[PDB]
């Protein structure tokens, strides 16, 4: 009936050789409403496949239990992609990376007996079976496969595991070779796919991520060249800036895969979107995925990326009958120039005409023609004869970004964060320091680390003017310190070095002593090698120096825990957990205090623009609107990096183009439409930090020109 194969020169689907334009877009990071306009979008720009993760620990957040409904139907989302007539790419894994909380990982999986996470382990083998034999099964159950008449041309096993298997050695090949026959044993009657697996075994397809992917060659001489990750930007992270890849760079990169046998690309992100809620993204990356995508984050068109590549794209179609007909010939046109020709024995013709230089623009001749040729540029002749396209020449209009105030301020209502402190009767202690994830299991960002210290009257620093010292050590990311109920300091890390230490003189007096420690994490490690392993929260040392003993070692004693915030238990969020009215409604109330709730009621701006919040007189914390988590906020951390002017010509990193320096990181949070009735919406924030919810507004996206 339908059928998908391949060859050494592209993907064969119903027995035609097809040039596969993809684009990425990732279901729960948009709503199930945006779904229909985001495809439709990609669908008019060229697109022929939407490629999209799995992501476990949304699916699977109870051992036993399982989610797919809401933004987590990727069934809905499939046949919405089918709808517009367009292919599927699905993206197992189990593992992701994709900058998602855990890698795509559930936690509770790390503390299955004898767990090891991507390795020969059968714990792990068991597990990850499961899951993808789950997903596969449900697929073939509403006919989703194109060999079923469904979208899904092509799945991915793993996600990057060579520079893993690398490292790890035997245990790795063991289970390479295991993850691909067990995943090809689905019989899922197409074919299987895996990135950055430079001996993936026979019959999967290697394919390539990056920037640039033109120099790939497939492991195998009868395997097609594909391109699973064109960068179209880069994440952001809070601390960081927001990065860019111009639009010429990208469409230059396409072009030159293209021009070298390359049959199927895929942009990374298409759409990037939101992290809504606590368990999206990655460690430190920031609520907005927006990575520079044709579409950003609120699902209007990035321009002139977006319009630059759909002419990049019909260029594509129109050479497409010769691409798949013949194979690339090149022909030296100057020192740093080339013409790729794919010439068939039809006679169709197409060739690309290149210029490696970013210097300067250069003249070629091409069958008695003259071409112009810009700085780091290809000239695309679907004809041979005419040349429609260049990568360096955009054509489309530019747009800017304005955000709009929509209404104006609200009235407020706060409510204050207990600040706990060890109890003797605690029930949850150690004898010593837990780590974080062990606990909270990450049911919430926050543990509170509690202890008792006793000061004896005999002491040095009592009578005379001097403090004692407090030295707490933590994993990671953010640690509040406390003593006797108040906040003595706050210390935070970045993603590249998140392990924090906390050094001052504090304030104690005879007696017993309360200190109250609160371990943040702002989502957890995605990438890297045994990164399930890695600490977070308060594992000391923790000394308190300059008493009569030398100093004491704090770490060794009763330690209290508690899991969360009273404000959390007692379900705040919602609008039938907002019952317990301690909410001051003071004329004059809270403001720049930490851990603080605060509430508000506001109506839907009347329009289609999609909204977000200003939350820059906001420190950090997390959002809800009618009950749904936005996710979090971090204005108070200052974007940071070299940001200089850049040139699309030349080779691209991601600090190439780096914007929003000595600014708040994210201060906009995306507002889904989908998620507010017309009247009596309710917008709960709490804020860790500290901040003003007067100038909270909520601001109307609008882009031109
Ligand atoms: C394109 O692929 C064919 C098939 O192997 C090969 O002979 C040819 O060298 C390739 N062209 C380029 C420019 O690499
Ligand atoms: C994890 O918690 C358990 C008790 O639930 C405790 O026995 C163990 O020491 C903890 N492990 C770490 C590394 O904190
Ligand atoms: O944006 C960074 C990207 O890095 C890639 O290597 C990975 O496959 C993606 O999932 C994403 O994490
Ligand atoms: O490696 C995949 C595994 O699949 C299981 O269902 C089977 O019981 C094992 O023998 C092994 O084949
Ligand atoms: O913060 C804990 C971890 O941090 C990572 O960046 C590092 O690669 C690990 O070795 C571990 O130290
Ligand atoms: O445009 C692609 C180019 O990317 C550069 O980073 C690389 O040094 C070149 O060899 C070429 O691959």
């Not at 449900?138 to 595991?161: D, H, R, T, V």
């Not at 930007?233 to 293209?258: C, H, L, M, N």
């Not at 530019?398 to 029930?427: C, F, H, R, V």
């Not at 906009?668 to 507004?697: A, D, M, Q």
Request: charged residues 20%; glycine residues 10%.
């Amino acid at each position: 009936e339908f059928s998908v194969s391949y060859d050494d020169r592209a993907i064969i689907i119903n027995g035609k050789r097809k040039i596969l334009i993809s684009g990425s877009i990732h279901y729960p990071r948009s709503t199930p409403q945006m779904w229909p306009d985001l495809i439709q979008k990609a669908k008019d720009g060229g697109l022929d496949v939407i490629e999209t993760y799995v992501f476990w620990n949304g699916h699977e957040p109870s051992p036993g239990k399982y989610n797919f409904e809401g933004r987590y139907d990727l069934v809905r989302f499939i046949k919405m992609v089918q709808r517009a007539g367009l292919y599927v790419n699905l993206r197992i894994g189990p593992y992701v990376c994709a900058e998602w909380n855990f890698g795509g990982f559930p936690v509770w999986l790390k503390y299955v007996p004898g767990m090891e996470f991507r390795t020969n382990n059968q714990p792990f083998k068991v597990a990850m079976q499961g899951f993808v034999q789950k997903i596969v099964n449900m697929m073939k159950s509403e006919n989703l496969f194109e060999s079923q008449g469904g979208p899904i041309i092509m799945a991915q096993i793993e996600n990057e595991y060579g520079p893993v298997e690398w490292e790890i050695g035997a245990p790795g090949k063991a289970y390479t070779k295991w993850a691909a026959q067990m995943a090809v044993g689905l019989k899922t009657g197409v074919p299987w796919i895996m990135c950055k697996q430079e001996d993936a075994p026979d019959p999967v397809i290697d394919t390539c991520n990056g920037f640039y992917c033109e120099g790939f060659r497939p492991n195998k001489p009868y395997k097609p060249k594909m391109w699973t990750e064109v960068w179209t930007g880069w994440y952001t992270k809070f601390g960081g800036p927001i990065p860019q890849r111009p639009a010429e760079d990208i469409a230059f990169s396409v072009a030159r895969f293209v021009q070298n046998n390359g049959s199927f690309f895929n942009y990374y992100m298409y759409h990037g979107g939101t992290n809504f809620g606590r368990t999206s993204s990655g460690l430190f990356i920031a609520t907005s995925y927006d990575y520079d995508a044709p579409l950003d984050e609120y699902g209007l068109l990035n321009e002139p990326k977006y319009g630059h590549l759909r002419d990049l794209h019909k260029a594509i179609k129109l050479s497409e009958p010769a691409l798949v007909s013949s194979y690339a010939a090149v022909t030296s046109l100057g020192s740093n120039q080339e013409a790729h020709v794919y010439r068939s024995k039809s006679g169709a013709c197409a060739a690309f005409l290149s210029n490696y230089d970013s210097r300067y623009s250069v003249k070629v001749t091409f069958q008695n023609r003259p071409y112009n040729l810009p700085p780091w540029s290809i000239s695309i002749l679907p004809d041979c004869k005419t040349a429609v396209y260049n990568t360096a020449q955009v054509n489309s209009q530019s747009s800017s970004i304005k955000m709009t105030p929509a209404g104006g301020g609200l009235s407020w209502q706060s409510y204050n964060e207990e600040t706990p402190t060890a109890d003797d009767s605690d029930t949850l202690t150690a004898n010593g320091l837990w780590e974080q994830k062990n606990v909270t299991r990450d049911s919430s960002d926050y543990l509170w680390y509690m202890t008792n210290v006793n000061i004896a009257s005999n002491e040095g620093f009592l009578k005379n003017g001097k403090d004692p010292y407090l030295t707490v050590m933590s994993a990671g990311h953010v640690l509040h310190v406390f003593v006797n109920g108040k906040l003595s300091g706050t210390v935070y890390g970045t993603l590249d070095n998140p392990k924090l230490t906390y050094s001052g003189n504090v304030k104690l007096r005879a007696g017993i002593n309360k200190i109250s420690l609160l371990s943040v994490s702002v989502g957890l490690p995605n990438v890297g090698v045994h990164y399930d392993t890695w600490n977070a929260g308060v594992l000391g040392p923790v000394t308190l120096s300059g008493l009569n003993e030398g100093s004491r070692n704090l770490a060794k004693q009763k330690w209290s825990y508690k899991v969360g915030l009273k404000g959390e238990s007692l379900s705040l969020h919602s609008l039938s957990g907002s019952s317990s009215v301690e909410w001051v409604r003071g004329s004059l109330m809270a403001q720049k205090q930490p851990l603080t709730w605060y509430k508000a009621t506001f109506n839907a701006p009347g329009g289609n623009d999609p909204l977000a919040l200003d939350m820059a007189s906001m420190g950090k914390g997390q959002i809800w609107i009618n009950g749904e988590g936005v996710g979090r906020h971090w204005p108070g951390y200052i974007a940071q990096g070299d940001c200089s002017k850049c040139s699309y010509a030349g080779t691209f990193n991601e600090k190439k183009c780096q914007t929003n320096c000595g600014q708040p990181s994210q201060r906009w949070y995306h507002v889904p439409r989908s998620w507010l009735k017309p009247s009596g919406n309710l917008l709960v924030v709490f804020e860790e930090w500290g901040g003003n919810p007067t100038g909270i507004s909520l601001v109307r996206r609008s882009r031109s020109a």
